[PDB]
Amino acid sequence: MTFEMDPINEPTLLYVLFEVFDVARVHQPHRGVIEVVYLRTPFSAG
Amino acid sequence: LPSRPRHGGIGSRQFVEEFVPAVYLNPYSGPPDSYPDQFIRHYNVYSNSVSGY
Amino acid sequence: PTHDVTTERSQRLQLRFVPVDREDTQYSYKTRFQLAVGDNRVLDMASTYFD
Amino acid sequence: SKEIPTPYVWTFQPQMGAAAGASQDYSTRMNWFSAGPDMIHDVNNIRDAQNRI
Amino acid sequence: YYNSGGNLGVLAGQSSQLNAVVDLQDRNTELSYQMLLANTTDRSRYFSMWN
Amino acid sequence: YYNSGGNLGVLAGQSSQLNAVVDLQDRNTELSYQMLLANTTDRSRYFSMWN
Amino acid sequence: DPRHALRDPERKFLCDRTLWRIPFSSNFMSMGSLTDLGQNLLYANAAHALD
Amino acid sequence: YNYAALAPRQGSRPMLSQWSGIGTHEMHGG
Amino acid sequence: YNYAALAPRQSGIGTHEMHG
Amino acid sequence: YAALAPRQGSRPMLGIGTHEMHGG
Amino acid sequence: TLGNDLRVDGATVNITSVNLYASFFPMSHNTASTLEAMLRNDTNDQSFNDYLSAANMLYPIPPNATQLPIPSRNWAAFRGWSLTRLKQRETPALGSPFDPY
Amino acid sequence: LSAANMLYPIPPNATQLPIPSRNWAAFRGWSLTRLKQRETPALGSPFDPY
């Protein structure tokens, strides 16, 4: 991506957020054990 | 022989023989009274309800 | 053995892979590589140490 | 999944000689988020075979 | 401390000490909550239970 | 970073997008490698590459 | 000494790199990866609460 | 039971909600 | 292919290392 | 008695006398 | 209102106590146990999605001109971009517990 | 070392009691040792401020 913008003297930083599917699934099988699964499909996490 | 044939609880051997893991195909579908109870740890069959503290 | 053991087709033993990109917070240094496993050769990951 | 569910492994209470509730087998389960459909089919077939057994 | 480094909160149960909270430093939960409030509630009305 | 949640390795196919490495904070691969070396090799000899 | 001063012996041991091991085997011995228990019905088909 | 014992009874018929009302989807980056 | 690669002329497979 | 032996897997895995006597 | 730093101005904050409060809906014990049993099943797991579901990347900008980001990957189930410009002085470094600068 | 590493904190006296119910299939045994809290770092977080 090539960004062209009006110049300003102060040092700035671009804020690009790539829209993804950040979803979590929570499973509670037996009285105090909690297992949670995470999934970020475009930008994988693990 | 004992006078009466020891009616009561179940030993470990018979428990593992008989209470095999259950496969619940369609889970919790239907009226509340049709649910499989005794899956809840604290639940008595007599006077069906959950025993609290 | 004198056949079907080595290639003699001009392929390298060691390979230096430079990261495609790197990001470094002041707690962690993350490097991303893409290693291309030839077309016919195979390697075991007991090699491929980070330098 | 309703078609192929995880079995409800029972819990033994060795004072009353009876089962104390049941919960899904959340201990013997295999992760497959790292596997594509080729191995997903194998894992599903294994779970179905385990349910049949 | 949201999406921070060493300062990570945990909701792990006593069973296996396995934390149910993961942060990636690439996620902005503060901005997500701000957007969620701005989209669900009329944020032009001030509330005092939270700022 | 072996068993951390935030910073971790993502070795996988370039187009696969599904990671082939999972770490769940209960595995101790550092102690695993330590014991593996201690059992497979004699540890009274110093090997300069990997300390 | 001929002019000694009694006695009061006290013994102790000192393990410096050892993990105490209690294998889940009926006779405490290692006859394979899977043990005598673990693959038993009582410990594989029924849930147990360890304390 | 019918789960109608858990809902307010507007006369006789329960004030049940929609069958598909369960579930939500609210997600946009902007 | 010809019965795999030749061996240097004049359990094989698998590992079971565990315990810790 | 092959079932008594520890099993390498599907097939169980399998030196019955001693010879140790010497004056030096 | 002013962009002054409060560390130099000497503000500081002292915390006396932190307490956690929770509200429990007083629903009948039988119904609550039934709901707990139903929700403990693997087919009734709860699902949540971050509202700003995105990977936030901040690329520094020298005070002129243009810039060019990002290497390779699989872009499956991508949902879009949202660009914006931020001043570096205002933006902190959330990757650390403390930002000395 | 194939195992699930659990670290249970110990106040500087006495005893302790771990672990809830589970299935325990294909279990292999227990290995136990004592470590000092000052020396054991935090596992999940990428950093340990403490």
Q: Which residues 6+ apart lie within 8 Å of E35 measured at CB?
A: H28, K51, K52
Structure-block tokens of residue D10: 């029972």
- E-chain residue closest to L17, CA distance: E14
From chain E, pick out residues whose CB is under 8 angstroms from the CB of C25: 5, 25
Q: How far apart are CA D45 and CA D39, in angstroms?
A: 10
Chain J touching partners, 3 or more CB pairs below 8 A: G
F30 three-class SS: helix
Resolution, rounded to a tenth of an Å? Answer: 3.3
Q: Can you spell out the DSSP letters for E1-51?
A: --S-SS-------TTT---S----SS--HHHHHHHHHHHHS-TTS--SS--
Q: Which residues 65-84 on chain K approach chain A with CB closer than 8 angstroms? A: 65-70, 73-84
CB D31 within 8 A of CB F22: yes
CB F20 within 8 A of CB D34: yes
- 10 Å CB burial of residue K65 (0-12, 13-18, 19+) is exposed
> Which residues of I fall below an 8 Å CB-CB distance to G?
16, 18-20
CB L18 within 8 A of CB L4: no
From chain D, pick out residues whose CB is under 8 angstroms from the CB of A39: 33
This structure was determined by cryo-EM
Residue of A34, A37, A38, A44 to mutate, testing the E interface (most E Cβ within 10 Å of its Cβ): A34
Block residue for tokens 């009948």: K28
Block residue for tokens 């292919």: I1
**Pick from B26, B35, A28: which is nearest to D2 by CA?**
B26
From chain E, pick out residues whose CB is under 8 angstroms from the CB of H26: 36, 39-40
Q: Is F26 on the interface with I (CB under 8 A)?
A: no
Q: Is K35 on the interface with B (CB under 8 A)?
A: no
Q: Which residues 6+ apart lie within 8 Å of L25 measured at CB?
A: D27, D28, G38, G39, G43, G44, G45
CB K84 within 8 A of CB H29: no
The reply to whether residue A17 touches residue K70, judged by beta carbons under 8 angstroms, is no
Helix (H) or strand (E) holding G41: helix G41-44
Please list the helix, strand and coil fractions of chain L in percent, rounded to the nearest 5, in that order.
0, 10, 90
- Positive or negative, the CA dihedral E38, E40, E43, E49 is negative
**Residue K82 CB neighbour total at 10 angstroms:** 16
